Amino acid sequence: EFLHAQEEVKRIQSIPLVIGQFLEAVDQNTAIVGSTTGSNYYVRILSTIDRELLKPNASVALHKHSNALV
Amino acid sequence: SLGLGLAAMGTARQDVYDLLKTNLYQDDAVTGEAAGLALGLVMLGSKNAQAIEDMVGYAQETQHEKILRGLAVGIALVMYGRMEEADALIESLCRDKDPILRRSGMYTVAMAYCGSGNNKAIRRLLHVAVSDVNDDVRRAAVESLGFILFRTPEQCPSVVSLLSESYNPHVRYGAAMALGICCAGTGNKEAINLLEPMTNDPVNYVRQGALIASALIMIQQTEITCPKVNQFRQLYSKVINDKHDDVMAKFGAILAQGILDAGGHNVTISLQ
Amino acid sequence: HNMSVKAMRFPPKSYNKDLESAEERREREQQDLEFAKEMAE
Amino acid sequence: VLESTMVCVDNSEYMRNGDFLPTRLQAQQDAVNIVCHSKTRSNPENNVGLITLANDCEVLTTLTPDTGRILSKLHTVQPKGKITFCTGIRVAHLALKHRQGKNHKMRIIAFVGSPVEDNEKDLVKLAKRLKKEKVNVDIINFGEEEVNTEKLTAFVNTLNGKDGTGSHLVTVPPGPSLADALISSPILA
Amino acid sequence: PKGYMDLMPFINKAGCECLNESDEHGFDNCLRKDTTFLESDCDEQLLITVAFNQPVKLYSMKFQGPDNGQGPKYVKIFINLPRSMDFEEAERSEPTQALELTEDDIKEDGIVPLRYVKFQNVNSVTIFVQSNQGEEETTRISYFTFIGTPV
Amino acid sequence: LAVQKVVVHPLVLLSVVDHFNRIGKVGNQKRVVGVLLGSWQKKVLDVSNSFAVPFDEDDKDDSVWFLDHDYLENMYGMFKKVNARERIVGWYHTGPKLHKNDIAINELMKRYCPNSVLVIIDVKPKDLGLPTEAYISVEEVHDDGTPTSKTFEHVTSEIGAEEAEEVGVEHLLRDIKDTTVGTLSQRITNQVHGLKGLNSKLLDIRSYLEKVATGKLPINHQIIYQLQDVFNLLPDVSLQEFVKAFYLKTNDQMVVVYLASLIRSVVALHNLINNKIANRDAEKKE
Amino acid sequence: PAVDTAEQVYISSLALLKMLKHGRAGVPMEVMGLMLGEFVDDYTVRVIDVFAMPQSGTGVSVEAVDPVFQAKMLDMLKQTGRPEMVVGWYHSHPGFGCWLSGVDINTQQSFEALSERAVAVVVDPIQSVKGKVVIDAFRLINANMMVLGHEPRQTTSNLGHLNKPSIQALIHGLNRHYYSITINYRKNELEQKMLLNLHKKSWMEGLTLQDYSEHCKHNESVVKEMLELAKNYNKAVEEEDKMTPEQLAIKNVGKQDPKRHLEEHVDVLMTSNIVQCLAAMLDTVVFKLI
Amino acid sequence: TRPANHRQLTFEEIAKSAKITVNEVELLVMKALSVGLVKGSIDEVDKRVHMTWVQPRVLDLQQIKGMKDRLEFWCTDVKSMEMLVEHQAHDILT
Amino acid sequence: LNAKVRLLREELQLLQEQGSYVGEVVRAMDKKKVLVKVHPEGKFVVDVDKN
Ligand SMILES: [Zn+2]
């Protein structure tokens, strides 16, 4: 069921996704992202995201509704 | 059918069985559910092959699920308190591809092993609860643990405590119901301590089962006997009077009040 | 590796408490109810 | 009547003969154009399909409530090969079992214009099988009736049994046109 | 047999029509045992109908055929059919039971089970032998009867 | 040949299974025949959809058989209207093995698709092999002087799924498919399946040779030619050169396994260090 | 005779794949089709098979049902053993959840006039992932009955309230103009074993040995990768000793973890070499000249 | 005729069996190798010819029976390791 | 392991919860009021969470 839960959380990554810019990691599961809409949001990060790729000034795909880093 | 079976429990009268079997064979969803359930009630504990062959044979031929739900309870009741004499039927039901027939095997395990504490039967129920394709069978697998351990009420809040926090809400619901069935009337503080967080479960029906189970555990119980009765008594009122609470969580709370003050505070639930 | 892994001890912490709190999980339901009761109307 | 018919047209080498004016291939094309048209007005829901009776049977057009497509297929039918009447009826019977509407009645139209080179036992057993499925095969014994008048006699007699005129064995002697004798035959009645 | 019994006395023997019958061996042979057999003539297919009083319950049949391959292989069973049944309405319809016989069931020391739930109140039974254990154009049946009880 | 590989999608398998079940319900059928629809990509076929067509064959004679080709055209226009990129790429039949009249049916199928591919989809759940066996009609020009005939040449088959088709399959296989087994265990199970598959293939050849020896079938002289090549290709693993090379290569991989295991153990020790520090720190504050 | 909340819609394995394939291919058009099956009883709706209606033209919305396409497809499906009536219609919602719009409500009313138990199934091929398909079955709520103060359906069971309604659906008229029918899937042993052949590798691949030149180069390259990772791994051990527990994870964001990559390289290399060794050993005796 | 283990024909055997001069053996192998009748190589220093492949030929029933007997040993070896890997890796087998 | 699975399923619902704005505090006010500047949307007077 852990594999099923990991597989089924990927629906949060379904297109379309608004493109943001990773700014700062507040903690493990939350971060500050700058959406291309022009607004800075304090959102959550999907746990299955490689945090080694969260370099500064890295383009990140955000949920079109909740702006979460997916 | 429900009235006739309720009035012919264990009587094993052929005329009642023949009439009820005719109603079951009509292949009506509404009638078959009551006819199938009453079929087991009338032949309660008889363990005769003809009732098993007719009901199990019908369950593998009918295409209406409501009939299966009544038959699943009916098949279990025929082999009630039969100890190992239901082993042959149990493996046949638990190996069935029909989810409802598998649910009947869990119920058959409960009735063949009522209060016997048979760890072999408990071994099968726990295996199905954690490893089964259908959530209903998992919920019934945990539920059947109450009927096997009610003679040793302290044993349930140890086996089912971890299942009370499982990912599957259906196993969590059955975990509530297992405590309610096994610890009915005893006012088990260890069991009540398990149900107390379950009344705040995110899933609605898990809350309903915990509320109903809490009523079963501490029916008639007073403040001195059970310190948490007053807390839960206000908990039932809060859920009912909460306009933003889910309706089926209120269904358990309203039922819980009925069981808690059942019989005008003069009755208790005791399987023994 | 097998010996080291078997020697790892998890303290008996109160599991399933790092999940959503009952009070805070209720907060979304009330707020999301107004979301459906207002945006749709 | 609400029945589905299949025309077992023959394109054997003997269809080049001029015994029927202008050609047996051309004469049978007029025969189909009239018998197929007759089945259309008997019931607008009637189904007509084409099956060739060459060396190897070939279903040119399955059952359809259309007439024009039958003749266009018959236009391209050229004389070739030898008749295979044993397999022609079965392949036509097989299409009858898979018709558009199962309420239709069995009916097969055979254009026997070449000798049937089989034993009487095989022809008789074919009739019994068609009688089992209530299949009526209507055959015109044109062409070589001087030698087919006995093999086909056992075919219809066994199919019709003792009662009921389910199938007919109308036999047109050579003349101007076999179609001119079809409108007076019980096939079109 | 365990409280049930063979039911040829109930079978009226007057409303029984065995289509695709053969003049050589008729339907009487397979209903009386005493050796002999029933066989078909036109085709391997063999349609059988059996009539009796309305109250009759079927548990099992014993369609024992010969061993050469003329014994039935795939059989279709139909119950309570209004109007007549041709070979197509026995081939293009949904049977109550369509048990595919094995060689063990054909053996004279063999009894085949039926889904007793679907055979409770039977007015008449239609039996459609579709194929035999081979490619024999005639299908033979040594013996046959229904084991059960009246309703 | 014209086809290098045929990819049969799970939708086709379910459609073929359902097609065999529904017609098989009304009457016992030796097989059911339908039409395969799909696209073409380079030289690999992409069979992705199928529809049923009326079909019947007399068991006694292979020559007598009927396929409703007018139905075949009518149903194609349906599927072309919905999906224009799916064209007729062959036919299918659920018969466990090939039939003698299959080459005749392919000719009727060949006029709609010149390079028609027959895929035999076995409804019975075989334990080892794939349910699909793709064939193509080719001209086998014999060297014995016998006239050229139309024979089916086998084309490798593979079951692949579209992204959305795969999504539904995993939903239907969610409970029974056990993904907890690691990659290393999966490959070893593949090796066990490879041993079983090779063994079954070898028994099929042995069964054929047994019947040939007793005269049940005559000598093909193409299988025997092929069989001599098979046994000639059997390597001699007892050569000194191969044994030394095998030993040299085996030791090369062992040290890499040794290095990886050496790194694994200390990394495991690091994890145990962190666990004991976390446990000691947690109990100190409590 | 109020409809029961415990009503279930059973979708076959074949039906689910067809709507998923048709819906995905028609993204983002709300591609529609008809669901064939049988109303078993007042509590069950079986969807044996579905077929896709063609798109008349451009436009991301549900078009009108084409009667000639429907009738002559239904007639021609009856010939091949599919005499199943239309029990409703399905259409795709490519990514924006499963609900009914204004056009969908009008389309469903056309089916409700003919069959009162018609079911509107909405499938989300975009949001559907492996092991979890976003599907929902809807039937319209009559405005006359609900306005006067009557629940759309009776609740005699717990079955219909096991799935919590999504906020997106509740926004778009769920429980106001239409209700959701719980969807259960009918799967048999036969179809389930058949689907297990997906991605089933050929028996030749199991005994096939990887090229030893590339295998050694892969052995070479990955071991060289651990040479740098081990050097970085040593630095990571000292750094984390003198480093505060608030940066146990924040400082790991945007910087590679040598320990994580070392495990992946070890895990990759261990299965690569063990499988190659075992396959080589098995082939030594299986393919032997003696 | 010779088994695959002993397919190293010396120049004398080819010369004697073909009634040709030992110096003409080398040209004979070229024709067989060039046309494609046999596959292999020539070791002139050791005067040996290393044939590795021959054109398949028509075989009698007895030779086919011997071929089938070879499959009996081949099938036994494959089955033996199939049980060996299954038994040894039973716990990790999926 | 159960907590990991339970947290994973709850994360999918959590990730659908709308994100939070990022603002700059101008000054604090009485009654737990704070004057902030949402990045594109100017100034606001906002509450303060009880935590
Ligand atoms: Zn829509």
Numbering used by the authors:
A (entry chain D): 71 to 140
B (entry chain U): 478 to 749
C (entry chain V): 487 to 527
D (entry chain b): 2 to 190
E (entry chain u): 120 to 270
F (entry chain Z): 4 to 289
G (entry chain c): 23 to 312
H (entry chain a): 283 to 376
Sentences from the paper on this structure:
The 26S proteasome unfolds and degrades hundreds of proteins to maintain proteostasis, regulate cellular processes and generate peptides with second messenger functions. It consists of a 20S core particle (CP) capped by one or two 19S regulatory particles (RPs) that gate access to the CP proteolytic chamber. The redox-active thioredoxin (TRX)-like protein TXNL1 is expressed in many cell types and was proposed as a nearly stoichiometric component of the human 26S proteasome. It uses its C-terminal PITH (proteasome-interacting TRX) domain for binding, while potentially reducing disulfide bonds with its N-terminal TRX domain but how it binds and is regulated remained unclear.
In both datasets, 30 s and 2 min after substrate addition, we observed non-substrate-engaged proteasomes in the RS conformation, with Rpt3 at the top of the staircase, Rpt2 at the bottom and Rpt6 as the seam subunit bound to ADP, while all other subunits were ATP bound. Instead, the PITH domain adopted an ensemble of conformations between Rpn2 and Rpn10, whose classification resulted in RS.1 and RS.2 states, with minor lid movement and no changes for the ATPase motor. Local refinement of the PITH domain and 3D variability analyses for both RS.1 and RS.2 allowed us to separate two major PITH domain states that we term forward (49.8 % of particles) and backward (40.5% of particles) according to the PITH domain rotation, along with a smaller number of particles showing the PITH domain in intermediate positions. Thus, in the absence of C-terminal tail binding to Rpn11, the PITH domain appears to form a ‘blurry’ interaction with the RS proteasome, using just a few contact points on Rpn2 and Rpn10’s VWA domain to swivel between forward and backward positions by ~91°. The backward conformation uses overlapping sites on Rpn2 and Rpn10 but distinct contact points on the PITH domain and again no C-terminal tail. The backward conformation appears compatible with deubiquitination. Indeed, for a proteasome conformation similar to the EA2 or EB states, which were previously proposed to reflect substrate deubiquitination, we observed TXNL1 at low resolution in the backward orientation and, in addition, detected a low-resolution density bound to Rpn11 that may represent copurified ubiquitin or a UBL domain of the FAT10 substrate. The backward conformation of TXNL1 is, hence, exclusively found in RS proteasomes, whereas the forward conformation is populated in both RS and actively degrading proteasomes, with the latter showing additional interactions of TXNL1’s C-terminal tail with Rpn11’s catalytic groove and active-site Zn2+.
